[PDB]
């Protein structure tokens, strides 16, 4: 159950969402051949 769906937060989850996406997308774009 990592989803943590039956929970609510505004500032914590929004900022984590934004940061989570920004970092992962940058690492994908690095286009490593590994």
């Amino acid at each position: 159950d990592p989803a943590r769906d039956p929970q609510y937060a505004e500032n914590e989850v929004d900022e984590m969402r934004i940061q989570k996406d920004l970092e992962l997308e940058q690492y994908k774009r690095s286009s490593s051949k590994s």
């Binding site: 609510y8 500032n11 914590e12 900022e15 984590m16 940061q19």
Partner: protein
């Protein structure tokens, strides 16, 4: 209080509501107090205000803590474990 869902506040707020309801049991008569003699109503209000003061105090503590925990969590998620 529903913004936090902590029973600390939801349960005691019900106790406050009960104090209100206890007075509300005579609402039909309260509707006519001020017109003739406001002192009786002053008593009913003071009772509710004393409860309101207790609940307001708990609300302030709740808001203080809520901000405190929010601020620290939003910092932790920005800390790279490999550096800091």
């Amino acid at each position: 209080m529903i913004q936090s869902q902590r029973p600390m506040m939801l349960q005691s707020a019900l106790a406050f509501e009960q104090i209100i309801k206890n007075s509300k049991a005579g609402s039909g008569g309260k509707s006519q107090i001020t017109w003739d003699n406001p002192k009786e109503l002053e008593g009913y209000i003071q009772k509710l205000q004393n409860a309101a003061e207790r609940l307001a105090t708990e609300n302030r503590k709740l808001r203080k803590w809520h901000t405190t925990f929010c601020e620290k969590v939003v910092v932790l998620m920005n800390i790279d474990l490999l550096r800091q």
